[PDB]
Amino acid sequence: HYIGDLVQRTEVELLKTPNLGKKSLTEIKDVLASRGLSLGM
Amino acid sequence: LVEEGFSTLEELAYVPMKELLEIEGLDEPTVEALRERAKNALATIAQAQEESLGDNKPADDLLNLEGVDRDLAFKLAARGVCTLEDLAEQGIDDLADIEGLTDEKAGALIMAARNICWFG
């Protein structure tokens, strides 16, 4: 629900989620990077 | 070719070279080229049909993901998911309408396909 929940998940965990493609993972990284955040903090 | 009695690509591919050389205007190089084209056409038709349904191309590529039966591979290929890469690129939502595929089973197959394509 929150950005703080998303930032704790690893890239390998997000790829296990249902309806989660490589394209949507790249979108999430690019958007988090635009805000100075990274996956796995 | 039709006036000389050839009606199928199979006849042109497999008939004895002597019968094709009896046709007026065919030389040995042109008969060899015609047979090679007929065999390549038959191979392209066989590959095309095998990718459209689940005969060989999708029965090996799309069916690489552990769990894919031949019926599911043909259902995937009917949606344009012909290869193990095409399946690795799908979401669960893109496969949700396939009769006999639960969201959990779709998720497991996509993850198996990704493990082979992206982490093998």
Swiss-Prot record, chain A:
The N-terminal domain is essential for RNAP assembly and basal transcription, whereas the C-terminal domain is involved in interaction with transcriptional regulators (such as CRP) and with upstream promoter elements. Homodimer. The RNAP catalytic core consists of 2 alpha, 1 beta, 1 beta' and 1 omega subunit. When a sigma factor is associated with the core the holoenzyme is formed, which can initiate transcription. Both the N- and C-terminus interact with different regions of transcriptional regulator CRP. The rRNA transcription and antitermination complex (rrnTAC) consists of RNAP, NusA, NusB, NusE (rpsJ), NusG, SubB, ribosomal protein S4, DNA and precursor rRNA; S4 is more flexible than other subunits. DNA-dependent RNA polymerase (RNAP) catalyzes the transcription of DNA into RNA using the four ribonucleoside triphosphates as substrates. This subunit plays an important role in subunit assembly since its dimerization is the first step in the sequential assembly of subunits to form the holoenzyme. Part of the processive rRNA transcription and antitermination complex (rrnTAC). The complex forms an RNA-chaperone ring around the RNA exit tunnel of RNAP. It supports rapid transcription and antitermination of rRNA operons, cotranscriptional rRNA folding, and annealing of distal rRNA regions to allow correct ribosome biogenesis. It comes from the Bacteria. The modification N6-acetyllysine is found at residues 22-23. The lineage of its organism: Bacteria, Pseudomonadati, Pseudomonadota, Gammaproteobacteria, Enterobacterales. It comes from Escherichia coli (strain K12). This is DNA-directed RNA polymerase subunit alpha. Belongs to the RNA polymerase alpha chain family. Signal peptide: none annotated. Acetylated on Lys-22 and Lys-23 in the presence of glucose. PatZ controls acetylation of Lys-23 but not of Lys-22.
Curated annotation (Swiss-Prot), chain B:
Disruption phenotype: Mutants are sensitive to DNA-damaging agents. Residues 1-117 are annotated as: 2 X 51 AA approximate repeats. Sequence repeats lie at residues 1-42, 67-117. Induction: In response to low temperature. Negatively autoregulated. Induced by cold shock (42 to 15 degrees Celsius) (at protein level). It is found in: Cytoplasm. Residues 1-54 are annotated as: Acidic repeat 1 (AR1). Residues 55-120 are annotated as: Acidic repeat 2 (AR2), required for interaction with SuhB, interacts with RNAP subunit alpha (rpoA), NusG. The N-terminal region interacts with RNAP. The central region is composed of 3 RNA binding domains, S1, KH 1 and KH 2. The C-terminal region contains 2 acidic repeats, AR1 and AR2, which bind to protein N from phage lambda during antitermination. AR2 interacts with SuhB and RNAP alpha subunit C-terminal domain (rpoA); AR2 cannot bind to both simultaneously. SuhB, NusG and the alpha-CTD of RNAP all interact with the AR2 domain and can displace the AR2 domain from the SSK domain (S1, KH1 and KH2) of NusA. Part of the processive rRNA transcription and antitermination complex (rrnTAC). The complex forms an RNA-chaperone ring around the RNA exit tunnel of RNA polymerase (RNAP). It supports rapid transcription and antitermination of rRNA operons, cotranscriptional rRNA folding, and annealing of distal rRNA regions to allow correct ribosome biogenesis. Participates in both transcription termination and antitermination. Involved in a variety of cellular termination and antitermination processes, such as Rho-dependent transcriptional termination and intrinsic termination. Monomer. Binds directly to the core enzyme of the DNA-dependent RNA polymerase (RNAP). Interacts with nascent RNA. Interacts with the termination Rho factor. Interacts with the phage lambda N protein. Interacts with SuhB via the AR2 domain, crystallizes as a 2:1 SuhB:NusA heterotrimer. The rRNA transcription and antitermination complex (rrnTAC) consists of RNAP, NusA, NusB, NusE (rpsJ), NusG, SubB, ribosomal protein S4, DNA and precursor rRNA; S4 is more flexible than other subunits. NusG and the alpha-CTD of RNAP interact with the AR2 domain. Belongs to the NusA family. This is Transcription termination/antitermination protein NusA. The lineage of its organism: Bacteria, Pseudomonadati, Pseudomonadota, Gammaproteobacteria, Enterobacterales. The chain holds residues 373 to 492 of 495 of the full protein.
